[PDB]
Design a binder for this molecule. Structure first.
Ligand SMILES: [Fe+3]
Ligand SMILES: [Fe+3]
Lengths: 132, 298, 298, 132
């Protein structure tokens, strides 16, 4: 019933940015960029010169630098959404596991081993204020 | 004109990529494809193969971009092409819809006060086609018609778990008033616990997923009141895809039998789950074994 | 954060045509424009100009073609262009939105169980801009923000009167929870009786129309029960646009005061109506005359 | 609540063809064609050679002939919806009042006099089976 209270609990979740309205309006140009890479003609033009392609989408400097550096965490900070952004790492020929592991600061090998063993435990990463 | 069976299934893209590259039998993927085998052998049986599947899934920013975000949509077209998600169009046959039943169901849901969006053109992403590949293999054409039923869980808020369970009950009602005697399935795709973004990517919560499976069978009405914050906190930011298992679930009656449950960790970033449910009154025999839990942690 | 006033206006394209060709003062159009003058003066007075107008109207196959048909949609873009309906874009300023309020309402309606479609890009047709030109004239820019809220009435079924009446109460509740103290209007456009098609085109039904106005003011709950067939029978195939006036009406309390009512036959093919309502409790003085009925047969 | 009884009622309204799914499916090509006239480029092409332009839309021979004859009643029988087709008569420079009167058999003048005098009366044209 209370939209404000419904959005505020999302802030207590560790290591997670929920794709709320405020992020969606922020990332609009960055997520529509990523959508254009569904078309093969756009993929090949983008790969021929990233920076000129990026300059047609009107990204903030922080968003464009995030793309060029392939820093998925910075891209999400500028309003990027993992499912629109999945078009970019697929353009690069990378898997969703690669992408996800590249946001954790583990090496690819450790992240793959962690999954084999059962994945990351919920213990300690449910609540910023509780600590559990 | 009857809903005989409810199936759920994870729709992880790396599954359609193990098939494409011929590695679906290596050591990582092998146990996954094997846990789907009892579903493939069950569904080809005469009387088990659906005429039409109502496939409930979340579009992953494929058919829908930031400009048009429908809460609930239904595909009423005759054909749907596999979407190009960055790798080129998935090399599987086009999905054939059923326009007379799809349009009957859309008119019926709006009469029942769901604010539906009718789609007459749309590409179907991995949400929809990976489960077809896992369950039907690699035929030249899919063996049945499919009605794609995309649900938003990308931009918040998604529909409540309460909204979703009620919707599956009105889908059942509209299939029952369709005057042909069709064998109709509802599938829900997605899940189970996973997180694709951020420093907490990798999150897997097998306690949450196994209790989810339990309650979905025996007390879905209670499970329907779980708020979104609980999915998010406990099963990862993409765990919210499990709201669609509730749509499938509300299309079956109060009493169901579970014929088969597969649960495996990991498959790419996620805990993979797949289940077959039938109304207890008309259910077949469960499979043997009835429940399979795989992967090194299990 | 407050819904101060509700307004309805017909939205016929010939009105904007009369404005563009300066025939607005001829023998046929003059009495129509004179009828709007009291609205034009009232809204301009100190304190009556809204900060934002939620504008509820039917897209006339302009923003939406046969491929994507939403029941309820809300525009959350910063800017909307006038559609090209065949004559070129209407020569009026761009409509500016209010993304913060638009997004707040969208999120609230979804949590209230409406299956909203979110639109972050779309052109606004005559349903949206003719009303603006009639109420605000021909400014260089519109004097307020506008949130377009398209409603499907083209492909059947449309939502029901009861769903519309309830949606307006939810919009009101979303407005009130918005943390800024804004003067917000809800406008419903379209109507009244008319039929644009076939041998029965030209249908007008002043008894239905005037009855509709009476009950909207005083018993909206009973009116929300009238079924689609009754609008179509009595008010013509296009008289179904009147269900939007229930959205406006549901955003006001039980007790309202009609400040001004205009009704006029004919205006192109249709019976033109327009009105201003405010909550009883906060209502200003009624205009004078308070009620005007025009036309050779009125 | 029963979709079949909801729709069947519509067939008791005389002179009126409600835009139900069944008409929408039948008119899909005809209405998409008309939507294309929202672009100034398409209007010029259509105008240059109508029949050639109509050939890209995969219409039935009846639907194609109705457009070329501008017979709006026959277009509606083919699934056309008046809101979509308004883009056709608008590309011709006609008004909605022209298009509606044309479907009544009346002349443009007698249609306009009837509107001035109060419009077509509902009496006798609300129900086929009931005669009112
Ligand atoms: Fe997914
Ligand atoms: Fe209209």
């Amino acid at each position: 019933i209370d939209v404000h209270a419904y959005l505020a609990e999302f802030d207590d979740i560790p290591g997670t940015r929920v794709f709320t309205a405020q992020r969606a309006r922020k990332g609009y140009n960055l997520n529509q960029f990523a959508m254009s890479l569904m078309k093969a003609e756009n993929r090949e033009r983008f790969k021929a010169d990233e920076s000129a392609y990026l300059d047609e989408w009107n990204l903030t400097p922080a968003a464009k630098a995030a793309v060029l550096a392939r820093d998925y965490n910075a891209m999400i900070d500028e309003g990027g959404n993992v499912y629109f952004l999945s078009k970019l790492f697929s353009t690069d020929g990378k898997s969703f596991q690669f992408a996800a592991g590249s946001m954790t600061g583990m090496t690819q090998e450790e992240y793959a081993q962690m999954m084999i063993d059962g994945g990351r435990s919920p213990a300690g990463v449910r609540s910023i204020k509780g600590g559990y | 004109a009857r809903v005989t069976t409810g199936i759920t299934s994870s729709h992880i893209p790396a599954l359609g990529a193990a098939i494409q590259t011929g590695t679906s039998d290596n050591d990582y993927w092998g146990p996954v494809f094997k846990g789907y085998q009892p579903i493939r052998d069950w569904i080809k049986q005469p009387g088990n193969m659906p005429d039409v599947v109502i496939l409930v899934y979340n579009d992953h920013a494929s058919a829908f971009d930031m400009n048009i975000i429908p809460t609930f949509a239904i595909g009423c077209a005759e054909t749907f092409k596999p979407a190009d998600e960055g790798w080129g169009p998935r090399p599987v046959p086009d999905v054939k819809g059923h326009p007379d039943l799809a349009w009957h169901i859309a008119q019926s849901l709006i009469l029942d006060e769901f604010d539906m969006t009718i789609m007459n053109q749309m590409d179907v992403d991995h949400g929809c086609t990976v489960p077809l590949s896992m369950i039907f293999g690699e035929p030249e054409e899919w063996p049945c018609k499919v009605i794609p039923f995309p649900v938003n869980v990308v931009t918040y808020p998604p529909p409540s778990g309460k909204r979703c369970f009620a919707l599956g009950d009105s889908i059942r009602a509209a299939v029952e008033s369709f005057p042909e005697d069709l064998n109709v399935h509802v599938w829900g795709t997605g899940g189970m616990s996973h997180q694709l973004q951020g420093p907490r990517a990798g999150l897997i919560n097998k306690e949450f997923d196994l209790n989810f499976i339990d309650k979905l069978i025996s007390d879905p009405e209670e499970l329907s009141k779980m708020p979104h914050i609980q999915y998010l906190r406990e099963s990862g930011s993409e765990g919210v895809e499990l709201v669609m298992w509730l749509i499938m679930r509300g299309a079956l009656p109060e009493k169901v039998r579970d014929l088969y449950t597969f649960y495996h960790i990991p498959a790419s970033n996620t805990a993979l789950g797949a289940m077959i449910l039938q109304p207890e009154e008309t259910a077949g025999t469960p499979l043997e074994p009835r429940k399979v839990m795989s992967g090194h942690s299990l």
